[PDB]
Amino acid sequence: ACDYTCGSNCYSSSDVSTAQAAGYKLHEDGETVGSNSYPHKYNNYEGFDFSVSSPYYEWPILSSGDVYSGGSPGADRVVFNENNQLAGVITHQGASGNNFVECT
Ligand SMILES: Nc1nc2c(ncn2[C@@H]2O[C@H](CO)[C@@H](O)[C@H]2OP(=O)(O)O)c(=O)[nH]1
C-alpha cells in the first residue's frame, strides 16, 4: 500500500516486517550474509531521529519481495534494534557517496 517509499521502490508494512524478521533472526544466531556481512551495526552517522533506542542494525530489504540471502543487497535497508523494534527504513537512492536518506 506504499507505506514506505525508497526512491522508485515501494514497500508495504508487511514487506518491511518480513525483511526485518529475517534480519533479526540472523542477528540472534550470530550469522551474516553477503560481501558486506549483513546484518551489521548501523551507527547512525546520518543522525536520523529514531524513536527507539540503540544499538541499531541495518539489513537489506529487496524490491523483488525476496528475503536477502547474500547476493546483491541493492540500495534499501530496514533498521532494527535489540528489541526487534523498527527504527526506520533508509536508502542510498537520492543520496551522495555511501550516505543514506530516510524513506518516506
Ligand atoms: N552511511 C553510513 N554507513 C554506516 C553507518 N553505520 C555503519 N556504516 C558503515 O560505515 C561505512 C561507511 O558508510 C560502511 O562500511 C557502512 O556500512 P554499509 O556500507 O553496510 O552501510 C551509518 O550510520 N551510515
From Swiss-Prot:
Using the chain's own numbering, where are the disulfide bonds?
A: C2-C10, C6-C103
EC class (word) = lyase
What residues make up the catalytic site? H40, E58 (proton acceptor), H92 (proton donor)
Catalysed reactions, semicolon-separated: [RNA] containing guanosine + H2O = an [RNA fragment]-3'-guanosine-3'-phosphate + a 5'-hydroxy-ribonucleotide-3'-[RNA fragment]
Q: Does the keyword DNA-binding apply?
A: no
Report the superkingdom from the record.
Eukaryota
Residue intervals passing through the bilayer: none
**Family, per entry:** Belongs to the ribonuclease N1/T1 family.
Name this protein carries in UniProt: Guanyl-specific ribonuclease T1
Native source organism of the sequence: Aspergillus oryzae (strain ATCC 42149 / RIB 40) (Yellow koji mold)
The organism that produces this protein has a lineage beginning with:
Eukaryota, Fungi, Dikarya, Ascomycota, Pezizomycotina
